[PDB]
């Protein structure tokens, strides 16, 4: 999986994932 992204919020890619930004 490529994707290119810029200074941005925090980022899941993949499966269903689980994270928590408080």
């Given at each position: 999986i490529?994707?290119?992204?810029?200074?941005?919020?925090?980022?899941?890619?993949?499966?269903?994932?689980?994270?928590?930004?408080?």
């Open positions: 490529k994707y290119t992204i810029y200074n941005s919020t925090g980022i899941q890619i993949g499966a269903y994932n689980y994270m928590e930004i408080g």
